[PDB]
Design an enzyme around this catalytic site. Sequence first.
Site, PDB file in Angstrom:
ATOM      1  N   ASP A 172     -14.196  51.531 -17.156  1.00  0.00           N
ATOM      2  CA  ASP A 172     -14.960  50.830 -18.174  1.00  0.00           C
ATOM      3  C   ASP A 172     -15.559  49.249 -17.420  1.00  0.00           C
ATOM      4  OD1 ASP A 172     -15.790  50.219 -20.764  1.00  0.00           O
ATOM      5  OD2 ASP A 172     -14.219  48.778 -21.309  1.00  0.00           O
ATOM      6  N   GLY A 209     -10.713  35.710 -27.221  1.00  0.00           N
ATOM      7  CA  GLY A 209     -11.430  36.930 -27.653  1.00  0.00           C
ATOM      8  C   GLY A 209     -10.545  37.779 -28.591  1.00  0.00           C
ATOM      9  N   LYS A 212      -1.884  38.118 -24.436  1.00  0.00           N
ATOM     10  CA  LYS A 212      -2.281  39.134 -25.192  1.00  0.00           C
ATOM     11  C   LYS A 212      -1.192  39.886 -25.741  1.00  0.00           C
ATOM     12  CE  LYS A 212      -4.324  43.723 -24.614  1.00  0.00           C
ATOM     13  NZ  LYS A 212      -4.750  44.873 -23.912  1.00  0.00           N
TER      14      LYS A 212
HETATM   15  C1  LIG Z   1     -10.122  42.284 -19.320  1.00  0.00           C
HETATM   16  C2  LIG Z   1     -10.905  41.462 -20.574  1.00  0.00           C
HETATM   17  O1  LIG Z   1     -11.600  42.014 -21.310  1.00  0.00           O
HETATM   18  N1  LIG Z   1     -10.577  39.994 -20.700  1.00  0.00           N
HETATM   19  C3  LIG Z   1     -11.246  39.432 -21.953  1.00  0.00           C
HETATM   20  C4  LIG Z   1     -12.311  39.813 -22.674  1.00  0.00           C
HETATM   21  C5  LIG Z   1     -12.518  38.804 -23.620  1.00  0.00           C
HETATM   22  C6  LIG Z   1     -11.903  37.637 -24.053  1.00  0.00           C
HETATM   23  C7  LIG Z   1     -10.909  37.120 -23.179  1.00  0.00           C
HETATM   24  C8  LIG Z   1     -10.376  38.165 -22.189  1.00  0.00           C
HETATM   25  O2  LIG Z   1      -9.395  37.887 -21.206  1.00  0.00           O
HETATM   26  C9  LIG Z   1      -9.435  36.888 -20.462  1.00  0.00           C
HETATM   27  N2  LIG Z   1     -10.333  35.608 -20.726  1.00  0.00           N
HETATM   28  C10 LIG Z   1     -10.151  34.889 -20.037  1.00  0.00           C
HETATM   29  N3  LIG Z   1     -11.270  33.855 -20.061  1.00  0.00           N
HETATM   30  C11 LIG Z   1     -12.197  33.725 -21.246  1.00  0.00           C
HETATM   31  C12 LIG Z   1     -12.677  32.123 -21.302  1.00  0.00           C
HETATM   32  C13 LIG Z   1     -13.219  31.855 -22.365  1.00  0.00           C
HETATM   33  C14 LIG Z   1     -13.945  32.899 -22.967  1.00  0.00           C
HETATM   34  N4  LIG Z   1     -14.949  32.548 -24.110  1.00  0.00           N
HETATM   35  C15 LIG Z   1     -15.744  31.481 -23.343  1.00  0.00           C
HETATM   36  C16 LIG Z   1     -16.660  31.298 -24.801  1.00  0.00           C
HETATM   37  N5  LIG Z   1     -17.044  32.371 -25.369  1.00  0.00           N
HETATM   38  C17 LIG Z   1     -17.661  32.210 -26.850  1.00  0.00           C
HETATM   39  C18 LIG Z   1     -16.296  33.487 -25.291  1.00  0.00           C
HETATM   40  C19 LIG Z   1     -15.230  33.294 -25.057  1.00  0.00           C
HETATM   41  C20 LIG Z   1     -13.733  34.250 -22.713  1.00  0.00           C
HETATM   42  C21 LIG Z   1     -12.707  34.657 -21.983  1.00  0.00           C
HETATM   43  N6  LIG Z   1      -9.449  34.856 -19.065  1.00  0.00           N
HETATM   44  C22 LIG Z   1      -8.579  35.560 -18.840  1.00  0.00           C
HETATM   45  C23 LIG Z   1      -8.472  36.736 -19.453  1.00  0.00           C
HETATM   46 CL1  LIG Z   1      -7.445  38.148 -19.233  1.00  0.00          CL
END
Ligand SMILES: *CC(=O)Nc1ccccc1Oc1nc(Nc2ccc(N3CCN(C)CC3)cc2)ncc1Cl
Length: 273
Positions: free
Chosen positions: A110, A15, A32
């Site tokens: 949020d 992300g 991050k």
């Molecule tokens: C707290 C927060 O907003 N976390 C968060 C938001 C967006 C992205 C990543 C973040 O942290 C996070 N994300 C994940 N796992 C995860 C896995 C895959 C995806 N993808 C799947 C396919 N997409 C096209 C979008 C993204 C997003 C996030 N694990 C832990 C954490 Cl902290």
Amino acid sequence: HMIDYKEIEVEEVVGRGVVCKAKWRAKDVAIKQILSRVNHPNIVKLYGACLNPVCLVMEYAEGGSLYNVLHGAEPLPYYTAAHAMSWCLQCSQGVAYLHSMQPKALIHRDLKPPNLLLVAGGTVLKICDFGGSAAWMAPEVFEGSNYSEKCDVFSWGIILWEVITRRKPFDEIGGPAFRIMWAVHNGTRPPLIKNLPKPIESLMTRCWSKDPSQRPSMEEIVKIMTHLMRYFPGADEPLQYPCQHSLPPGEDGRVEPYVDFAEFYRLWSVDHG
Ligand SMILES: *CC(=O)Nc1ccccc1Oc1nc(Nc2ccc(N3CCN(C)CC3)cc2)ncc1Cl
């Protein structure tokens, strides 16, 4: 913990204020680059943090975000009323825990599906936090009022409407964020749902109350939702069937649910009559 960055192996960006999947001790992890007493199954765990580059080290949610599941790119997964009620129960359990934090309550501020992450085939939900959010914000927040943990109850109510309808709240308003703020400040709420069971409608609309003191506590939501799951078997079923979903026409201030409540009415009827 205070992790050594070299001990971590960055992988693809997840992300983007940028998060990436990584291995650290053969454990999948999210990191991050530019609180510790939090320990709950429904809250993303903070493993530790590195020092240069300063960065957070957290558990990795393989299922991505709830928002992605609901509204993301095709092919979208099928899901059931049980999944919808389960996600919201698990969300209220994570949030209740934050509100019970001693010596002071932790308010999420949020709460919205982009921050709700999924694992175990899409069945287990975990709250994530790093803080177009207008759509889930309680009006007292963006009117600069003093808010309390009841602002999260408002957001939860919107989320409940969202997983039942598989619609983006206030998608018809559009324009900049201030148009939604103006709308919701003036009492606009997501349209009512045809055939929604009276107990769920009661809970949802209560959470939407203008007066934050008329909203239920999260502890009450957790308990109410716990007892309703008796009528929503199947929440452990992994998300795995394909779905071709298209927005039915929505006017008359009344939209159709995406999920199906026939089985709820059947199981309710066995108990009551
Ligand atoms: C707290 C927060 O907003 N976390 C968060 C938001 C967006 C992205 C990543 C973040 O942290 C996070 N994300 C994940 N796992 C995860 C896995 C895959 C995806 N993808 C799947 C396919 N997409 C096209 C979008 C993204 C997003 C996030 N694990 C832990 C954490 Cl902290």
